[PDB]
Structure formats: structure tokens, C-alpha cells
Amino acid sequence: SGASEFVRSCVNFETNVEFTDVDAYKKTHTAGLASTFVVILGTHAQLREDALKELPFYCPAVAEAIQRVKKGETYAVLAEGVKNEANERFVRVLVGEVPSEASRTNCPARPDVVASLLSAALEEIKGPETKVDVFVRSTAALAIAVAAARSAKRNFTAKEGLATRGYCDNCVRLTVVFPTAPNPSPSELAVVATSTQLCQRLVDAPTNLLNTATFAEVAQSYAKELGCAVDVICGEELRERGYGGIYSVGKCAVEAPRLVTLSYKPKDETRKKVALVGKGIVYDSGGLSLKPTNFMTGMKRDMGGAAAVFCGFLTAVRLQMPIELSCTLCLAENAIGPDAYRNDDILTLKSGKTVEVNNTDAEGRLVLGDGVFHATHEISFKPDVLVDMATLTGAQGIATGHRHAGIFVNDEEEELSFLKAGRASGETCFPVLYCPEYHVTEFRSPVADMRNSVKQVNNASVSCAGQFVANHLSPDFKGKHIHVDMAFPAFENDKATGFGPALLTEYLRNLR
Amino acid sequence: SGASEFVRSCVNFETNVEFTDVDAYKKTHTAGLASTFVVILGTHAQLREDALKELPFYCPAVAEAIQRVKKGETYAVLAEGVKNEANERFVRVLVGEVPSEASRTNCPARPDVVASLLSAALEEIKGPETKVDVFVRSTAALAIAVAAARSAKRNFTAKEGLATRGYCDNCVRLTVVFPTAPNPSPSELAVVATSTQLCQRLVDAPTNLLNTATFAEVAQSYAKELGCAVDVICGEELRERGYGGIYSVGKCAVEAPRLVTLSYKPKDETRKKVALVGKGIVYDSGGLSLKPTNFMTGMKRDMGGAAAVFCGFLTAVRLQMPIELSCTLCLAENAIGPDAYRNDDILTLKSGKTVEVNNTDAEGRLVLGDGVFHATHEISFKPDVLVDMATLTGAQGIATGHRHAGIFVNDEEEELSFLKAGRASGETCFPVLYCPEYHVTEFRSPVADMRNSVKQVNNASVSCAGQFVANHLSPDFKGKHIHVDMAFPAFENDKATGFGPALLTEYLRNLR
Amino acid sequence: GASEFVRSCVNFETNVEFTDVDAYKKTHTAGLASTFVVILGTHAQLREDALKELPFYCPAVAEAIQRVKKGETYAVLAEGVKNEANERFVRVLVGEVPSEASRTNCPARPDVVASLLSAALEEIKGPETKVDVFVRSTAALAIAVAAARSAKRNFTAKEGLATRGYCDNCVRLTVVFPTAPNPSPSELAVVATSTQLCQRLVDAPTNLLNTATFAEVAQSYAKELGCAVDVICGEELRERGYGGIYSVGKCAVEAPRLVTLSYKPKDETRKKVALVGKGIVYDSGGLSLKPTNFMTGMKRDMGGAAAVFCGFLTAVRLQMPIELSCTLCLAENAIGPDAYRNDDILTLKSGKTVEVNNTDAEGRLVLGDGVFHATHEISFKPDVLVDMATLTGAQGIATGHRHAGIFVNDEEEELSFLKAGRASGETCFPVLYCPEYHVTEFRSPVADMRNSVKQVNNASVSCAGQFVANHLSPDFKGKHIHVDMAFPAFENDKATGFGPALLTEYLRNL
Amino acid sequence: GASEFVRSCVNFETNVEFTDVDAYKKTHTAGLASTFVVILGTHAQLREDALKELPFYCPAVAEAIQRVKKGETYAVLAEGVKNEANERFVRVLVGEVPSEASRTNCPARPDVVASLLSAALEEIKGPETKVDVFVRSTAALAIAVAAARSAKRNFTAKEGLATRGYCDNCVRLTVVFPTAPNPSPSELAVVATSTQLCQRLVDAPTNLLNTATFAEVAQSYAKELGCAVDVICGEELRERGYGGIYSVGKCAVEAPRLVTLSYKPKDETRKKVALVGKGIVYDSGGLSLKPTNFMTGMKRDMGGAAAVFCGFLTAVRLQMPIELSCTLCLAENAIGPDAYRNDDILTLKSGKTVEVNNTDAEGRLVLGDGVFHATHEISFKPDVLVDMATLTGAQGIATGHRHAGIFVNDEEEELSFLKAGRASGETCFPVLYCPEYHVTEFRSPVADMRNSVKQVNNASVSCAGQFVANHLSPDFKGKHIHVDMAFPAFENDKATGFGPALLTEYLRNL
Ligand SMILES: [Mn+2]
Ligand SMILES: [Mn+2]
Ligand SMILES: [Mn+2]
Ligand SMILES: [Mn+2]
Secondary structure (H helix, E strand, O other), rough: OOOHHHHHHOOOOOEEEEEEEEEHHHHOOOEEEEOOOOOOEEOOOOHHHHHHHHHOOOOEEEEHOOOOOOOEEEEEEEEEEEEEOOOOOOOEEEEOOOOOOOOOOOOOOOHHHHHHHHHHHHHHHOOOOEOOOOEOOOOOOOHHOOOOOHHOOOEEEOHHHHOOOOOOOOEEEEEEEEEOOOOOHHHHHHHHHHHHHHHHHHHHHOOOOOHHHHHHHHHHHHHHHHHHEEEEEOOOHEEEEEEEHHHHHOOOOOOOEEEEEEEEOOOOOOOEEEEEEEEEEEEEEOOOOOHHHHHOOOHHHHEEEEEEEHHHHHHHHHHOOOOOOEEEEEEEEEEOOOOOOOOOOOOEOOOOOEEOOOOOOHHHHHHHHHHHHHHHHHOOOOOEEEEEEEEEOOHHHHHHHHOOEEEEEEHHHHHHHHHHHHHHOOOEEEEEOOOHHHHHHOOOOOOOOOOOOOOOOOOOOOHHHHHHHHHOOOOOOOOOOEEEEEEOOEEEEEEOOOOOHHHHHHHHHOOO | OOOOHHHHHHHHHOOOEEEHHHHHHHHHHHOOOOOOOOEEEEEOOHHHHHHHOOOOOHHHHHHHHHHOOOOOEEEEEEEEEHHHHHOEEEEOOOOOOOOOOOOOOOOOHHHHHHHHHHHHHHHHHHOEEEEEEEEEEOOHHHHHHHHHHOOOOEEEEOOOHHOOOOOOOOOOEEEEEEEOOOOHHHHHHHHHHHHHHHHHHHHHHOOOOHHHHHHHHHHHHHHHHOOEEEEEOOOOHHHOOOOOHHHHHHHHOOOOOOEEEEOOOOOOOOOOOEEEEEEEEEEOOOOOOOOOHHOOOHHEEEHHHHHHHHHHHHHHHHHHOOOOEEEEEEEEEEOOOOOOOOOOOEEEEOOOOOEEEEOOOOOOHHHHHHHHHHHHOOOOOOOOOOEEEEOOOHHHHHHOOOOOOOEEEOHHHHHHHHHHHEEEEEEEEEEEEOOOOHHHHHOOOOOOOEEEEOOOOOOOOHHHHHHHHHHOOOOOOEEEEEEOOOOOOOEEEEEEEEOOHHHHHHHHHHOO | OHHHHHHHHOOOOOOOOEEEEEEEEHHHOOOEOOOOEEEOOOOOOHHHHHHHHOOOOHHHHHHHHHOOOHHHOOEEEEEEEEEOOOOOOEEEEEEEEEOOOOOOOOOOHHHHHHHHHHHHHHHOOOOOOEEEEEOOOOOHHHHHHHHHHOOOOOOOHHHHHHHHHOOOOOOOEEEEOOOOOOHHHHHHHHHHHHHHHHHHHHHHHOOOOOOHHHHHHHHHHHHHHOOOEEEEHHHHHHOOOOOHHHHOOOOOOOOOOOEEEEOOOOOOOOOEEEEEEOOOOOOOOOOOOOHHHHOOHHHHHHHHHHHHHHHHHHHHHOOOOOOOEEEEEEEEEOOOOOOOOOOOOEEEOOOOOEEEOOOOOHHHHHHHHHHHHHHHOOOOOEEEEEEEEEOHHHHHHHOOOOOOEEEEEHHHHHHHHHHHHHOOOOOEEOOOOOHHHHHHHHHOOOEEOOOOOOHHHHOOHHHHHHHOOOOOOOOOOOOHHHHHOOOEEEEOEEEEOOOOHHHHHHHHHH | HHHHHHHHHOOOOOOOOEEEEEHHHHHHHEEEOEEEEEHHHHHHHOHHHHHHHOOOOOOHHHHHHOOOOEEOOEEEEOOOOEOOOOEEEEEEEEOOOOOOOOOOOOOOHHHHHHHHHHHHHOOOOOOOOOEEEEEEOOOHHHHHHHHHHHOOOOOOOOHHHHHHHOOOOOEEEEEEOOOOOOOOHHHEEEEHHHHHHHHHHHHOOOOOOHHHHHHHHHHHHHHHHEEEEEEEEEEHHHHOOOOHHHHHOOOOOOOOOOEEEEEEOOOOOOOOEEEEEEEEEEEEEOOOOOOOOHOOHHHHHHHHHHHHHHHHHHHHHHOOEEEEEEEEEEEOOOOOOOOOOOOOOOOOOEEEEEOOOOOOOOOOHHHHHHHHHHHHOOOOOOOOOOOOEEEOHHHHHHHHHOEEEEOOOOHHHHHHHHHHHHHHHEEEEOOOOHHHHHHHHHHHOOOOOEOOOOOOOOOOHHHHHHHHHHHOOOOOOOOEEEEEOOOOEOOOOEEOOOHHHHHHHHOOOO
16 A cells, blocks of 8 residues: 555546537536636637637627737636526636647647646636536647646645545546537547546656556556456566566666566457557666766656556557557666666677666666567567657757657658657657667677667767667567657656657557 | 674763862862863963962963963973972973954854864873863853863774774863852763763764664663653654654665654653754765765764754753653664665655655755654653754855854744853854745645755755754644754864754753 | 946836825726726735725625635736726736745735736736736835836846837836825835836846946936045056955956945934945956856846945935945956956955955955945945845855845844844845854965855855955944845846845834 | 968869779770779679779789678789889779668768778878779769868878978879769869868868958959958947847957858859858857867867858859858857856847857857848848858757758758758758747847757757747748758868758759
């Protein structure tokens, strides 16, 4: 308990966001607004459409709010004479103006601002299960769903004794109201929102609750619930079976490292075969390459890639997508102590390749190296596409920024396809240089096949960490490889975003 | 053994300083000076009083020394024709001139210079139990006692095989000779001096001798000797009973953390009720927020606050003060290893409040938080005053300096009363800002009730560490809270000072 | 560029006016004189019956009062409120001020008044838009300051405002107290004017406000106010033995200057005060060059001079019964071939020699010459010397962002100054006064003293104060108040105008 | 010293000539025209039958081909090979070029051609020694560049070569393609000349190549080429509102200058391009002074200006059908009393105000004035603006040593530019184009923007591009290509001449 309550919370998790449309809303609630707190979000043009004037909260104060609000900001009023289920004299209404401007590399619905406007609005909300209606004028259903899900205040939290109430402040029930029946459907969006939120909680959970054993436990429960096969290679079995990357990185920790692989073969298919691999470093101390304090804070999030692929998988099974899937979680804690793998130790990864460790804090690529080899050589099928996701490098932020995950991809078409999924999902990406001939030289070793950390830090370092992982692909793998460095997109204002699963979901959804 | 010899040394400890006056000295020693080494300390004016000319070591060379000595310095002569018990032809006499100038924030007797003059004089002394007479012209008995006690070379030491002789160089027996019978009395001053010296030894003992178990052992022995009740919550009992601050900080160490509480109910009373709480970090590595070498040296002293409150308590029981007292020692070693509490872990202190750890090297406030809650909510009485003492922040030195402990106090009167005890004892203090409304914001957490380390280091950081401790006061506590940051005053010239107990003793002595 | 900033400072008038509920009701008989209203009060003050009688009170405002959170605003559109403009809606912001305040803080909590008001005024776009701020606190002076510093008269060069006096004139404030205030509205307006002028001086960049343009501003005010003014500039500083300020500033493009203003009141008085201020218009560090992230904001290293200058300005304008000198220690601490070196030995005006061991500890050098000038070179004998400066990073560590550290040689006067801090909202807190421990940190083997401490962890705020005290005239038997206001000079990366009101309140009660 | 370097640049001619196997066989009927031969090809190319027909082929060369390793050279003495000199032995180096190349790289792998050739030429001692380089690749332009930059025409002041134009003339190269190349040999020679001139400009130290001597070189070329040239120097920059470039450079001994060349082609064309280049002849950091190990190599901070200048030079010489302006933003970022400060507020030519928060982010300031000049102050309306600069250390982190980072506002043009990178061997790769996220990193409370990012870990290469884009004329509706070439400008601590060929290829295909 403490941990087993967090586990129970993850296993049963439902979202607090529902989706509908204006017409269905008007048919279901003819006895007034079903809430007393309303957020209306749209562009300058969308907020002046005639249809707005027919919405159940519209009144002269709301019309004034629309005239006064600034681009990128909310404007709040108390609306009088709006009939509502609670029979309040006043309904709280917040108008948020979303910019219309978006670059070619961004989601044109600007869910980044939808999220921040919504977040700011929901800070007024005190009480338990307070019903909030969010009327949105965008029809970009998936992107709005994600934004709403990640702003709905279902984050992990241990404030005020909430450890006893599933580490959750249940202060809001959201209803998102689209102009017309959305595509995807409300039931699809709810699955997506659920995965976004579950991912968010997994990431911001501290390591004293979410460690390698409790993460594995969650995945085992989902596997049983979902009818999926699950394989766990734990501890000494990793050493005995030659998985020296993940074993060495994790052997020092109190809870043993584990490679957890889930499988899904759809009922009637199969359109493609995809292996997912995720970096599940439940805490990163640095090992003997110990991080300073201000770089060690937030390293509970170093399992973000594992949470992403796990929650993406979860969504794919739940939406019964016609794709055969494996999901491999590379679970370890990078600890410091007498047993810690050393700067100079030589490891033999499952691939058979030897690695001279020159930075113990470059540990994620080691666990991934064992993971991608496992996915491409040790499992029941031959994937057409391998996607690995990880919170890998500080350099990622320097290169592609806080809101675009860096992608290292060995095929131009599949890179474009993935970027497209980023833009539709709002979980945006951008390419880093793919040039194996320049990256491989950064890991020259005089005593092993390679080192794990670059000789020069100023030579496409996001790409080189990708290349290191690629070095442990099975030599028979002729498929597409998408490597995702999501170090910074995994969080915003010092809170987890749930980034990854929806990007992934949208990508898989569009495979043929 | 090694450790058990240090323990035996602490348990039986007596001082090597005695106190008397000129008249009693002349009645007891009519067969000449009882020593051949004499130190005479006074201001420029005090050294020219007529009474000096009647003192048993006075002679023309001593008169010349008085004329030539410089303010703040000693001047040594060999005095011929002074009759003495040893029948030496020459008596060594050192004249030390103490400045008369003192600020309103300082002890007007300037024991700081008394101590340094005496220390310098005692460096001439080689042999065993060499008798030294120190004639002082100040009547500030308590301050002189402390200065003398801390300069008498009864420090911890392991030089030259002295591990077998109680880790003590017994090179000096001091007699301090006041102008007239002192207030406090010689027997009172001897108790004070004993506590000052015991505190000095505790602080400068290395952790391989004084750890959480051997400190507890010392306290248990004193409790039995003194007729005081003692309560020990050790190891897993701390975890099981919800003391998650002190437990987590200390769980990684080889010797388990412990909360040790002593109690004293006087025979006939009670004038006030006082809880003492002390930071007993027997070594501070930093934990995962590992200190660099030059900040890790001297961290054997991170138990100074526990030594202070323990030795103050000791003095109060021995002088049979009319005050009900608890003394809680918060004992832990802040170690590094696989089991170390992490930067991101969330702890539940005994207070029920959750703490997100953002610096494992801000550990003292965690152990104190459990300590002050224990003192204000878990013990047999309701204190009127809580005093916590600790070597807390480097900032303390920046703010109030090497010789003034920083005090964070929630009541103006009690702060003044405490400053007054500082000035009388020579163990001087100075206030840091008390402004809870500004401090509490420095520990905002997105996932717990609070963080443990400030967001900004340049915003009254000595005060904020005080506020953190205050956050875990029992919500029913309506009393006075005195928080003492004594990081720098705990040592001088790279040796422990024994700071704390006399300050404390003087404060308790004057309560009504 | 610079002469437009100068003209802007010289002619400066506040945008804040003060009144009370009763006078407001008598003058504005057609309803509210504005369509944007802020009402600020404690939880209790916001539930008094008197609130219900105020001209913006209505059911939406009542609901706002019920929903607002402590320390936050809650905005509504109020319908059916009579207003001069006959708008259907009046914008009303309810701000709840905490009632809780420590013994070291202003009990009216102007810190939160200022942040609530500032947040409310972000909604105001257009030119000279009228805003009424109804406050339930009677702490007039503290409210005035908070309002003044939040009224958006800050220095700014955005959007071509260089041509409009480097000022976005988007707001006219009227502050409405429950009853006629003490001090009076005309007094509060002078205070507010000085707060705002100080704010603009501090946040002006050095390419506009250098040693010559600051001196120019002071010279203009002196002429306007009938005050005598003395300027010792450049080589005159060297020739006359002011080697502290001269050496610190001699490398800069614009020469160092000691500028001293004097005021003898119309009516006789006994109280005599010298003010001395650190006017380092920019601090590069000199050869002890600051890294970039410590060099940003060093345009504010003249905050102490701005404080004393604006306090002086208030005292003259209110005709306070105190004889006053105000010495501005103006220099730019530059780097170059001519820069004073780490090892150079300087002879300050006091005749004491100083071995420079950190060229970035320059403020105490210019102050050392300043305080000697004020205590020995000057036509009168001050009873009190107050020096104000943005001196040490340590100040923040010790006393924090909102409390200036004070080093004071007299207990009573220190309490008196703390009291002025609490009444003005420009709060202070003591640092250790113990000369016997500070003086040892500046031992030199070749000069009377060094300028920088040997140990940084030994009451360093206090030691910088002690250094300045070392150059007091040996005649001076008076009270010395040293104010380290490094952090209180700014908030959210904008100048606060801290200093002048603290000072004004102290002088007012002397 | 300086005028000898100037004369050297003005009269510069390449030492590389281009031909093909058939023309070589017709002209050199007495056998090989050299006694030092390099043969470079892939594993497959080196085993074709055609190799056996080449004039240095013999059994030792055949053995060399069998033994050489991928990415390395293998040297022999070839006996019995007919040569003009009738030497018994001809020195022959076989270099195997990898065939593998990523989609982001030049498939002829000129990176390895260059390093193989460079290694081979280390064996060459004497003056004007003839070397034949037989290449099996038909990627003419990429080979030309590689050869040009490896031909040992670098700047050098070793062994008194200051008197011999700062040039070790130890090699004459003849590059022999399999068939008559496209582009033609006379075209490749112009390209090679520009590559080499660019190389020399970059690695020249600032005591030779400052703002005046660079301007002098450009003025000479303009006269020689019949191109108009405009120079705005020193106080004319201040007086005319070019406060970015003026402020950055005003502290230096040699005044800042905006130098703009123009070319209208003989034959009519529609395509109009403005080039703008960062010409920071030395970057100390200014008051944000660089540490020594970051200050070394900052003579190369004018690489972008050299690139655009040498590209322009090529375009004029090949008579390309494109109207061209070339603006060199020349300044030295110096430290001293007059240095622009961290906090100063500048007014760029665009009229936008900039609060300086890092004086070492100076290149974007000079470029901001440059791109505004090109888009608003100039006789024509460019369809495309290309700015080139050695901007950020982050560039290397993001896109590496051999790929310049490109920030481009149009997808198609970005692809077009990447394609020119791959054909030229002077390769690029995109950085994130997302203005809506970049602009927030330069929020200022007192000016339109800051110059340095608030967060360093938020697409910092892209944000420096965005800063420059902020000073584009608001009229400008065209394509903007921003090139951060900080690391590709050098290799093994020697200038590469990167930029001009990339540029030339892009313009050629426009
Ligand atoms: Mn790591
Ligand atoms: Mn610590
Ligand atoms: Mn300075
Ligand atoms: Mn620079």
C-alpha cells in the first residue's frame, strides 16, 4: 500500500472528459445548460459566426466578452438570465480566443493554446466533480480531445491526503462540445483521452510509487484485461540470457530491471506489423556519472517513452485496430552504489555487440539497444516498422524545442507520415538529421565495438543517440525505423503532458 | 571498541576547568602560586587597577608586559622572584589585553578575544595535566566560563595514539580566577563548562565513532544516570509509525535513523514548559544531491544542533532548573546508495503533509519537521516554547556571520529574550527575517503539499528553511517558536566551539 | 534619444489621483466616473454593510465577492450600474487582500494590493482610460505607493514610444479611500509622483540615463525647486582627492560626478539629514567582469541614487521641516585600458588607502567618498546620515526580495526606520551591526583596507555597510542608517520605485 | 601586412584545373603529365574495365586496388608507366570512396574525397608540383569543391609566407573526370576559385582581415566586375538609424560597415535574389566576453559574409541570369568603455527596439539591419532572401559538423536548397520553422524584443533565425532562407570555404 493504491488507480483508470456536439447537446438538455461553468474557445472569426448567437449560454455579457477578449487570452463574465439545471442566477462563462496562425510544422487548430486557455479557466474551479462545458469551434476532434484531456486536472497529485483518493484531485468533469458530430467519434476520443491522462499520471508519479515492479504490474493487469499475451524477463534472467545492456544499467537498483513485452494479433487482419519499444527508466540518478540536483529533478519522467508506447498500445487494442503489435517496455532504475555499472566497464548487449561505457548517464540507449534487438530478433513476428520512444537527450530541446519531439527516421516517406500524425494529433514532431555515416564515428572505441557516449557533443547529438540504438537492430531487419526523442514534450510548466500515445495512435490508424 | 571507548569517554565526562576568585585563591594558597604558568586577561583599564599590583604573580616584568602588550594580543614574560609551589626560579606569565569596545549585538566582555588569547597562550603548554591559572578581570562569569571551557584543549583528538586515552590530550588543568566570588557560582559554571566541552567533543568526533547508534547510546546512559525518561523510535518503527521525513533521509545509511526523546519533570514546579528539538545528522554526504569534497568536509558537524540541545538539557537537569523539558534528537545519516531517497520522491511526514523532494541535501529540515511535530503533538505535554537548533544553511554565514547564529522567531518578545541570553552567554545570535507569507511560496509543489528546497536561493533562504520546519508544527500549537541556525558558530579555526548549550542554558534560566 | 528622456523626467507628472467615498459621491452625481472599477479589500472588509452603498455595487459584484479567492481577482461585467458614460456594462474587478501580516510586514499588505491592481490593469488597452480603484484599507501612504508603482507609468521603448516620452499613457487612476485620507490627497500625489519617477529612472537603460543625463535631471530639478546644487565632475574629482569615485568611474565614456543638492526649509527646524546614494548607472564589474546573467539588470545599479533623489524631491515639495543634503554618487563602472585594477591602491577623500581586491565591489568606494563628503566637506553637520544602495547579491539571500537590509549604528533609529518601512509598505529588516567583526574582513598588507571581503560567508551585507562606515568623518557622532536595497528595487523584472516613500515617511516622523 | 593580404585576395586565382580522360589522352601523348597521381573511386568503380585503360594503370596499382580499405588511401611506386618526365617511378595513391550515402548526404561522398585527397597531398613538398587526380565520379560540382578545398591554397603565415601572399603554392592540381564534365571545366574553375578565396578570407586573422580590409576587397572586386557598390560606414550608420550594426561595432578600432554589391545580368531575367551575410571579423563576445576556448576561431565569425560574397562573385563571373544584391554586415564585436551593454536599448533600421540581454548574440543584430536594408532600402524587390551566418554553437548540436542548419519559411524552397546542398556537397538540414513558438523567447518588458533567448533548450538555432526574420520589411512577401553554418565553415581546425558553391548551385537552378 502506497504503491498498490497507485497501481489500482492506474489499472481501473477512466477519463473525466466526454465529447458531444451542439445539436446533440440541444436535444439532451432542453431544461437549460447542464453546467454553471462554461468555456467557449474559438478563433476571432469562429467566435463571430451566427451559430454562436444560438448557443444556450449566449447573452449580452458573453457578446461583450467576445468583443473584448485578446488573442491568446481568456475573458471571464457572469452571465445573467441563462437558464441552467442548478438554478443559479449567474453562469460563469469564459471566452478564450485561439490564434488562427499556425506554421506548416504545427497543428493548425493550435491545441497548444486551447490547452493553456482551458488550463487557466479550470483554475477557478474549486469543488468536487464540478461539471464544466467546453464549447469549441474547431472541428479538429483528435487534437482538441488531447488538449482537453491533458488540461482536465486528472494529473497525479499527493496534496491534501489525496493518496487515499487514488492520487487524484477529482475537481472537474468536462464535456467538450463540438460544432457538429466529431470525427473521430466520441467513443474513440474517450479512449484517446483516457490514454493521454493515464500516460500523464504514469510520468508524474514519483519513483517511490512507480518503479520497475509496479510498472510491470500495471502492464500485466492490462494484458489480462485486454486478452493480450505478455512476456516478462526480469533480473538475473536478463543477465543469464545475454541482455547485458538493460541488466547492467539496472542491476544496482533495489527493484530489478525487466523487459516487458505485450502482443496483440487482431481478430481479422493484418494490414501491417509494428513493434513499439519504450525507454522505461523509472528514475535516472545518472549512475556513477551522477547528475547535479537541478538536472536530477524531473527524472521520475525518464520513463515517459515507456508510458507513451504502453498507452498507445492500449489505445490500439481498445479501438481494435487492424495491426499486429508488439510493445516492449525497457524497465530499469539507473541507480548509484557499489554495484553500479562503471565508466570503463564493457557490456555485451543481446545483439552480441560489445559496448565500452564512457558515460553511465547515457543509459537509455543501452536499455533501448536490448529492446530493439529483442523486437527485431527474439519475438514471434517480423515487424515492418519499429518505433522506439524515449526521453533521451537535453540536446533534443536545443534542436527541436519544447513542443516538437525530435525524430530520427531511416525512411523519408515514413518520416512524413509520422510528422502528419504529429500535426493531426497536436503531439507535434520534427526531424533530426539522418546520416548514419557521420554518427557512427562518434562512438569509436579502442577496446569494444562501440562506446555509448559521443566523443563530441556538438555533432548532431540527438541523431547520434538515435544511431546508437539503430546499431543494435537485428542485421536481418530491412524495415522502417522511427526513433522519437521526446525529452521536453513530455512536460510543460513542470507537469507531465501525456505526450506520445495520441501521436502514435494517429500514425497507426493511418497505416495501410 | 574504537566506538565504545568514545562512548565511555562521553558518558563519564568531566571538565578540566575550575572557577574561583582572588580572595579565595589567597586564602587557599599562602605558600605561593599554585602553578608556574599564569595568564592574566583584562582590558587596558582593568590591567591598571591597583588590585593587580597585589596579585601573587605581580612583579616588575609583569608590570612591563602590561605597558607593552597590544590590544587583542598577548605579551609573555618570565617572572623572577615569584614564589611558587614548584619552586621554579621563573614563572611563565602571559598578559592578554581584551578590547573594551563591544557592539550592542555582542557580549560586552568580548569572550571571543578572551578565547583566542587564552588559546594562543595554551599552545606553549606541552606536558600532562599542567596546572594553569587564568586570572581574569571581567566579572561576566558565564561568558568567561564558556570561553575558557572551549579553549582548554579538551577537544576530540586521535593524534599520537590518544584513541586509547579517551580521544583526549590531557595537557591542561585550568583554574579561572575572578576578581570576586562569581555569579553564577563556581559549581554552576563547572556544569556549564562541562556541557560546553562535551558538546565540543561530540561535534568534532568523526562519524566512524559518533553515529546514530552511539549518539543514542550516550543519551540513553545520561538518561539512566540523570533519572530522566527516554524514548527511542528506531528504524522500521519510524516508517511504520509515519515518521517519513526522518525515516527516508536516514534509511540508506548503515546505522538506522532514530528519534530519541528525553524528558525531565522537576521535583517542585513548573514555571514553564519547553520542548527542544535538534538536528542530529551524524554525517551529511548530500545524498543523491552529493556535496563536492570541499563542501563535504566538516559534515561530521551536521549533528551540532542535536549536541547543543542535548548538552543544554543536560545542564538544565544538573542545575535542577524549575522547567519541564523534553529534548528530541533527530538522528540520521544522510547517505548515498541504491536506497537513497530521490530528487522527485514524495514523502509523508508525521504531520500528514506531503513533501516533494527537490534537493536531497536539504535533509535537516525534513528530520526537524518530524521532530517538531513529535514535540508538539506526540509527547506527554504541551510546550509553551519550542526551540529547535540546527546547522542548517550556508546562507546563515552570509546573513549573520561566523559568530552569530541566525534566529527565526515567531514572537518579538521571546526573540529579544533569546538575544539577551546570547549576549550574556557569549554564544551570540541575531535575527533573520520572520515573514511566513513570503517564505511559504518558495516551496510550491505541483504534486505535493510542498517542496523541501527553495525555488529561489536569493530570497531570505535562512528564514525559508525555518519556515519549512514551522510548516510541520502541530496545527494546535499556539506557542512560541525559536528556530536557531548555528551552521557557522558551531566551529572556529576548523575546530568545534561547543556553541549552543550555554545560550540555551541562559535562556531557560531566565524564563518565568 | 537621451534629451527626450531627460525632458520626460524633468516635467514628470503622476497619473494617480486620490479621494474618498464621500467626496466621490458629492462630485459624481451622474453615477460612476469610469466604466472600469477595481474594488480591493480583505475578506471582512468586502462584507461590510458600507460596501452595499458603493456606486458599483450590484448582484454580480456580490457574487464576485463570494467567489473570489484570497490573493486573487475575480472579474465581472456589472449590469444596471449608473455611470457617467451610460454604458450598459461596467467592468468590475474584485480583489481579495489577505488580512494576515507578520510583525515585519505592512499590515495593509500593499504587496498584494500592487499585484492585484497590476493584474487588473493588464486588461486596459486604450489611451488615458479612466479607472476607479476603491480600497477599503485606510493605510493611505502604503496604498498610494502600491497604486503608483502599478499604474503602468514605467519606462518603455516598445512600439515607438521613444517619441511619446518613453511612456505608455494607458491609464488614469483614481484611488478612493473610505474616508478623507491621512496623508492628504495632494501629499499622496507628490509621493506617487516620486515613486513613479524613481521607477522610470531605474529601468531606463544606460544609453539614455548615464552620469551626465542623471546630473542634468538633478540640475533642472534644483533650479525648478530653488535648491542649491554642487557638481564635482571628472578631473576635479581626481584633483580634489575623491579617488574612490574617480577611479571607479574614470574608464567610462561619461565622467563620474558627485552631485549634491541642498534644501533649507522656509520655517526654522532643528532636524538635519544627509542623504547619500549609489548612482552606478551601469555596472559591468570592471576588470572583475560580471558574467552575462549577473550583468543583466545592472542599469538598476543607480537605484539608491534614484531613491535619495526622489525622496529629496518629495521633501522639498511637501516643504518638510528638515534641512537636507542629497549627494548622488554618479559613475559608470566600465572595462578597458584605463580601468582601475585588482591591486591598485586608491586614496579616498577620507585620506584612507584602499587596496582594490575586487573591482566589482565598486559601489562602496563611490559611497565612501560620498559619506565623507556629506560628513566633512559640506556646510552643515547632519544628525543622521542615510545611504541607500543596490549593494550586494547577499542582501537577497539574507533579507529577501521585499525587505531591504539595513545596517544601523543606533538601535532606536533602526526601529524608527523599520516603522517607516512598515507604514510606507517599502519594508526593511536589520542585518547584523557588529563593526568589531566586520573590519577584519578587509585587512590589507599594503593599504589601510581592502574593498572586498576575505570570506563571503561572514555577514557580507553588514561588511559592505562597515566599509562605507570606515570613511565617515572621524568627527561624525551621529546616527548612520545604511540601506542595501538590491532586490527590493525590482519585481518581475520591472523597477518598483522602492526607497523614496520609505525615506519620506522616516523624515516625516523624525 | 594587411595591404599584402588585400592584394593577395583581389588577384586570386585557383590552382585547380579540370578535364576528362579522353581530352587527357589526346593532349598527353608522351604519357602522364605528372609523376604524382591520385585515383579516387568506389570499390566497384575501381574494378571497371575502363580503369585498366588509364595511363597510370599497372600491376602495382592493380594490387593497391585489391588491398586498399574503404575510406583510406594505399600508396605505391608504379614502375614502367610512361610519363612526360621519363621517371622510372610514378607515385600513385589509390583512395577508395564509400558508395553508401544517406538521403541527407551527397551520394558522391565528397567528404571522403576531400579527406583522401588532403591526406595524399601531405606527401607533396616542392613548389608548383603537378598532381593528376583521376576521379571515377561524374558529380562534377561536388568533386570540384572537394578538390578546391583540399588543394592547399589555405591562408598561412608559416615560414615567412607573408611575403609570398600568405600562400604555400606547393601543388597544381588537374582533376580528370571520366567524360567531359557538367558543369564545364571553365565553370568548375570559377567555382573552385570562389571556394578557395572563401577559405582564405575565413582563416585570415583579424589583424589582416578587419572591416576596412574586407570592404576594400569587395570594392576592388566591384570595380573589376562592373558592379555597383554602396558603403555605409561608421557614423553614417548611426545617423541613418542602423542601430543594430552600429552599436555592435562602435567599440572596435575599425568602424562597422554595411557593404552592398549589385549585379544586373546582360540578358533579361525575372529571378531576383538578395544575399545577406554576417561579417563579424572578430567576436570577443563584447561585455558578454567569451572564455578563451570559445574565443579561439572567432576570426571565422565572418564566414557568412565570405560565403555570400564569394557566391556573388561566382554568379557575376558565370553571367548567371539573376539580378543580385549582396549585403555584407561588417563589424568587429569588441570590448571596452564604448561597448554596447547588456540592458542597452537599440533601435534597428526596421524601427523595432531591442533590449540587449547578451552582447555575444551580436550576429543577429547586424543581420537584422542587413535583411531590413535588403528588403526595404534597396532599388529592387527580391523574390528570395538568403542570409548566411556562423550563428550558434547550438547549430552543431542540432545538425552537426557537416550540415548547415536551415530555417526556411517555405517548404518548396527549403527542398530546393537542400537539393543544392546535396549536389554541391555543401550539405544542409532543416531546423524547426515555427515562428509562433520562437517569438515568445524574446519577450522584453521595456522594448519590442530581447536579442537572446530566455531558454537555451527551446529550438535555439530556429529562434536566432526568427530574430533575424523579425526585422524583415513588413512588405516582404517572399521566400526567406536562413543558413546557420557555424560548424561547416571549418574542419580539422581549418576553413572549408563552405557556402559559395551551395549558393551557386541554388541560384543556377532557380
Ligand atoms: Mn541518463
Ligand atoms: Mn544537507
Ligand atoms: Mn559591482
Ligand atoms: Mn557572438
